[PDB]
Amino acid sequence: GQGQWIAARDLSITWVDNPQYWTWKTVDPNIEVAELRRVAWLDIYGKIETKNLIRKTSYAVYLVFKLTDNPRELERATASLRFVNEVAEGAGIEGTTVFISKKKKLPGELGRFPHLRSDGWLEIKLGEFFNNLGEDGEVEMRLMEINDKTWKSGIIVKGFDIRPN
Amino acid sequence: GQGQWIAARDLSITWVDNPQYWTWKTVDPNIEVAELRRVAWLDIYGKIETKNLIRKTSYAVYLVFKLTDNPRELERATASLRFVNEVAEGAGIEGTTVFISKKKKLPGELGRFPHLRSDGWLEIKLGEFFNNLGEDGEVEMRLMEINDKTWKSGIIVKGFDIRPN
Ligand SMILES: [Zn+2]
Numbered sequence: 047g048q049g050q051w052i053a054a055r056d057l058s059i060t061w062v063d064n065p066q067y068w069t070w071k072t073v074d075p076n077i078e079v080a081e082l083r084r085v086a087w088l089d090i091y092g093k094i095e096t097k098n099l100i101r102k103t104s105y106a107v108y109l110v111f112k113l114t115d116n117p118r119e120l121e122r123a124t125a126s127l128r129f130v131n132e133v134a135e136g137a138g139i140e141g142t143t144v145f146i147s148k149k150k151k152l153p154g155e156l157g158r159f160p161h162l163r164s165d166g167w168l169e170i171k172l173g174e175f176f177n178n179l180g181e182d183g184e185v186e187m188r189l190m191e192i193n194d195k196t197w198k199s200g201i202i203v204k205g206f207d208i209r210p211n
Numbered sequence: 212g213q214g215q216w217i218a219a220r221d222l223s224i225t226w227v228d229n230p231q232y233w234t235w236k237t238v239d240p241n242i243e244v245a246e247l248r249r250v251a252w253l254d255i256y257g258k259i260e261t262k263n264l265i266r267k268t269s270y271a272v273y274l275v276f277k278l279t280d281n282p283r284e285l286e287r288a289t290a291s292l293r294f295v296n297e298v299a300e301g302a303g304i305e306g307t308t309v310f311i312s313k314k315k316k317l318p319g320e321l322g323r324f325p326h327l328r329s330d331g332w333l334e335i336k337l338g339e340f341f342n343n344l345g346e347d348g349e350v351e352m353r354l355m356e357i358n359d360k361t362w363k364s365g366i367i368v369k370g371f372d373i374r375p376n
């Protein structure tokens with residue numbers, strides 16, 4: 047209907063079923079979240095059908111998460127959002143740089159930073175799209191940091207929030 | 212439902228005022244357009260302020276163009292659209308691959324292709340953005356092909372069309 051919610055268990059998260067790299071946990075009120083213990087290939091992916099959404103509406107897609115006390119190597123990451131059918135053959139993941147663990151210290155600092163939601167969780171905008179009549183297919187999005195030389199740690203993934211602007 | 216038009220003369224097109232590379236011509240109905248003869252650094256750039264647009268409205272930006280008989284090195288190109296204030300320090304253009312001169316052969320082919328307008332010109336969608344309160348600053352968009360080893364040729368630029376979705 048008016049947007050969509052993707053629980054963490056319905057996102058495609060690389061290595062998420064390996065307790066060495068991710069730790070599944072339940073937090074109040076009885077919601078399952080995936081905490082990142084340590085991983086070098088970070089990829090959190092989700093996909094929706096636009097046919098389900100209210101038409102003639104602009105939608106924003108946010109990754110809802112929290113940070114532990116000691117996050118690592120998550121100052122920046124790559125956010126991507128694109129219509130599946132609009133991806134040209136051979137093109138890679140063509141995303142944008144966003145900030146995750148870095149704090150916006152200057153009022154004039156440029157970039158997309160996370161926002162503290164009313165419910166105490168953080169959210170980072172992955173992208174934006176207009177749903178015309180729900181006939182343009184699937185929309186996919188992800189946040190990733192795949193630097194093989196760094197160990198990412200300290201992000202608690204709750205899910206993707208697709209909301210009307 | 213009121214949009215904005217940026218004629219080619221008002222766009223920032225590198226090398227466009229050197230006759231060796233671009234040719235300005237008047238065409239029916241008495242409009243000025245820029246025809247690319249040859250260039251290795253193709254960049255068609257425009258920028259608008261959201262404070263002048265209608266609030267609470269989603270906008271799409273389209274490059275309106277035509278092709279000569281023999282376009283060269285323009286099968287694919289890079290489209291970009293982003294809020295100026297959301298560019299992380301040190302990040303590149305961070306665009307997406309679109310098709311310009313390659314025609315869609317089979318219906319199952321993925322990617323963003325141009326299509327014909329009522330005025331006989333082609334247009335390719337460069338991106339979308341939501342104007343909330345007109346306080347998020349400017350939005351910049353461009354189509355570029357900056358492979359130094361290839362001469363791009365055969366595109367005729369009319370301008371950027373900014374239309375509410
Ligand atoms: Zn699907």
Ligand SMILES: [Zn+2]
Pocket residue numbers: 119196
């Ligand atoms: Zn680092």
Ligand SMILES: [Zn+2]
Pocket residue numbers: 130133186
């Ligand atoms: Zn894809």
Ligand SMILES: [Zn+2]
Pocket residue numbers: 161162163164
């Ligand atoms: Zn808020």
Ligand SMILES: [Zn+2]
Pocket residue numbers: 273326334
């Ligand atoms: Zn169109």
